[PDB]
Amino acid sequence: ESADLRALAKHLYDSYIKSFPLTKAKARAILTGKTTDKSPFVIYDMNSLMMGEDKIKFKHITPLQEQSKEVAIRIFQGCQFRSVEAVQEITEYAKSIPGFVNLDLNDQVTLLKYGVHEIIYTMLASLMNKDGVLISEGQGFMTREFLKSLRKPFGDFMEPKFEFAVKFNALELDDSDLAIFIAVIILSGDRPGLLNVKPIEDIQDNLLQALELQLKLNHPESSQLFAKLLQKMTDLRQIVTEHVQLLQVIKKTETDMSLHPLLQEIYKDL
Numbered sequence: 217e218s219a220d221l222r223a224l225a226k227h228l229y230d231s232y233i234k235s236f237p238l239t240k241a242k243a244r245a246i247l248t249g250k251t252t253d254k255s256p257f258v259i260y261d262m263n264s265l266m267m268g269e270d271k272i273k274f275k276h277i278t279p280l281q282e283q284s285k286e287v288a289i290r291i292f293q294g295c296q297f298r299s300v301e302a303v304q305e306i307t308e309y310a311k312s313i314p315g316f317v318n319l320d321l322n323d324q325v326t327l328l329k330y331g332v333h334e335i336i337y338t339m340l341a342s343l344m345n346k347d348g349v350l351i352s353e354g355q356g357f358m359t360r361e362f363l364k365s366l367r368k369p370f371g372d373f374m375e376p377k378f379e380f381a382v383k384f385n386a387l388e389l390d391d392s393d394l395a396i397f398i399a400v401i402i403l404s405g406d407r408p409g410l411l412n413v414k415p416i417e418d419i420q421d422n423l424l425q426a427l428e429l430q431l432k433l434n435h436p437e438s439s440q441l442f443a444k445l446l447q448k449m450t451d452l453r454q455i456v457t458e459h460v461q462l463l464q465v466i467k468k469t470e471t472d473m474s475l476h477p478l479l480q481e482i483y484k485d486l
């Protein structure tokens with residue numbers, strides 16, 4: 217079993233590296249001083265925000281129609297394209313989790329519907345420190361306090377993720393850890409409406425075994441870490457429930473929103 221749980225762990229890490237362009241290790245190097253790379257552009261207020269476009273070569277430019285909208289909404293709408301990119305990254309990773317692709321295709325949809333955001337906030341942590349977050353493959357850094365300064369209820373979106381990220385990062389996980397962790401989250405057989413719970417649980421039992429050992433070998437100086445991570449898995453579900461609640465408020469209180477259709481599909485019946 218042991219050499220095979222290491223094989224599964226390595227196979228996952230390899231896909232993880234293949235799937236997600238920006239690793240925690242890289243993000244961490246940029247966040248600390250510790251890279252040759254030029255340091256990112258800091259967006260710390262409205263003025264630096266406007267300079268963003270000139271300084272960062274990022275992948276979504278706002279079209280003519282959407283240019284007259286208020287900054288909160290533009291920021292709100294801008295960021296959706298990254299989530300979309302995340303969604304397929306996550307899908308590419310899912311496809312490589314040994315046994316996932318052989319599930320009922322509807323169950324494939326359901327685990328993805330429920331995991332994408334748990335995984336996004338997990339991975340978002342890696343990009344965070346107490347001051348703000350890396351944006352555009354780490355070419356930029358938006359301050360936590362700037363995001364917070366946005367008018368209600370837009371200044372309320374990121375705080376709870378930052379609240380999560382500060383604590384989660386204190387566990388000092390790395391990419392190997394996170395590769396298995398991400399895997400255990402997707403293959404969760406307790407998601408509403410699943411068709412065949414058992415084949416999912418069988419995979420997850422295997423991933424959890426790999427996680428436990430991986431944390432054993434990789435974290436000498438912290439008893440109870442594996443349990444803390446299970447509690448995180450739960451913590452994450454509440455972040456998203458908070459997050460869909462706030463999204464509902466946006467829908468009912470704001471006039472010129474544009475919720476991206478792929479995201480709308482994921483959010484639909486959570």
Ligand SMILES: CCCCCCC(C)(C)c1cc(O)c2c(c1)OC(C)(C)[C@@H]1CC=C(C(=O)O)C[C@@H]21
Nearest residue numbers: 274275276291292294295298351352358370373
């Ligand atoms: C009120 C909603 C806040 C959500 C923002 C979350 C946060 C700070 C990780 C963020 C993510 C983003 O993708 C952006 C981003 C911020 O800011 C820009 C300027 C919109 C950025 C532009 C294009 C972007 C790019 O091409 O890199 C990304 C986009």
Ligand SMILES: CCCCCCC(C)(C)c1cc(O)c2c(c1)OC(C)(C)[C@@H]1CC=C(C(=O)O)C[C@@H]21
Nearest residue numbers: 297299300301303304476477478479480481482
């Ligand atoms: C296109 C196949 C049928 C669409 C229905 C499925 C639904 C609504 C989840 C959806 C899936 C999509 O892939 C898109 C999508 C919506 O909306 C966009 C804006 C077309 C999106 C753009 C590029 C996309 C991207 O960046 O990957 C995806 C594309």
